Amino acid sequence: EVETFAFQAEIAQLMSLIINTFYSNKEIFLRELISNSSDALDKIRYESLTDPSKLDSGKELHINLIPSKQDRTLTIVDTGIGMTKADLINNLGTIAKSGTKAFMEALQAGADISMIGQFGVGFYSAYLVAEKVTVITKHNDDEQYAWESSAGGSFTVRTDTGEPMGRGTKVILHLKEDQTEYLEERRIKEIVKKHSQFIGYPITLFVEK
């Protein structure tokens, strides 16, 4: 079964702003997703210090960047703590409502879209470059889920039938047709070096076959 949900009005407004505002500096999406992965890796590492069994689903703590020219996707994979069903449907959106309102006000007060991560809603910068985002995620003691949205005010959640991940999150960016530069090894290297060079987990940039 696929369940369809309405975004909170403030998050739908944020997504429309990101999709519709003219802003050439689109590359900031990657730093935001890598930062989210780093935060999730921090969380499972910290929890493992008092409950080592939390790493039974995988001890490797890393970030993979995987381009696919054939699928026109850029995938950001981490082995962090992952998200529960309640995270996906309700609880992360509840936290994001406050940051969205703060971001939207700062925007009017002269802030830049690149400051989005300071408001805890950096994920939605993915819609600078993606027409659709699919998020596959697995938290210990919950099932593997697929979250998906092409914006337009709704998202879906379903139990994922694909390959099991163990633990963590995969953000699959279905790139807009004019945003395929973010499949180039060279371009991704440039962005990671510029924005993400001090992240405390190995970032592997996969090469296309």
For residues 207 and 69, the answer to whether their CB atoms sit within 8 Å is: no
Q: Which stretch binds ligand GQ3 (CB under 6 A): 51-59, 79-87, 108-116, 178-186?
A: 79-87
| 28 near ligand GQ3, judged by CB under 6 A | no
Among 28, 34, 82, 134, binds ligand GQ3 (CB under 6 A): 82
Q: Output phi, psi for 157, to 5 deg.
A: -135, 135
Residues near 36 by beta carbon (within 8 Å), at least 6 away in sequence:
122, 123
> Residue 177, exposed/middle/buried by CB under 10 A (0-12, 13-18, 19+)?
exposed
Residues near 206 by beta carbon (within 8 Å), at least 6 away in sequence:
64, 65, 66, 67
Query: Which CB atom, from 41 or from 188, has the smaller least distance to ligand GQ3?
Result: 41
Q: Which stretch binds ligand GQ3 (CB under 6 A): 34-42, 101-109, 175-183, 201-209?
A: 34-42
- Count the Cβ atoms, other than its own, within 10 Å of residue 56: 12
Q: Using CB under 6 A, which residues numbered 85 to 144 contact ligand GQ3?
A: 88, 92, 123, 135
Total residues contacting ligand GQ3 by CB under 6 A comes to 14
- Least spacing, CB of residue 84 vs ligand GQ3, in Å: 9
- Picking from 188, 102, 89, the residue whose alpha carbon sits closest to that of residue 146 is 89
- Least spacing, CB of residue 95 vs ligand GQ3, in Å: 8
- Least spacing, CB of residue 71 vs ligand GQ3, in Å: 20
For residues 100 and 172, the answer to whether their CB atoms sit within 8 Å is: no
| 147 near ligand GQ3, judged by CB under 6 A | yes
| 65 near ligand GQ3, judged by CB under 6 A | no
User: Looking up tokens 């936290």, which residue turns up?
Assistant: 95
Provide the binding-site residues for ligand GQ3, judged by CB under 6 A. 36-37, 40, 78, 80-83, 88, 92, 123, 135, 147, 169
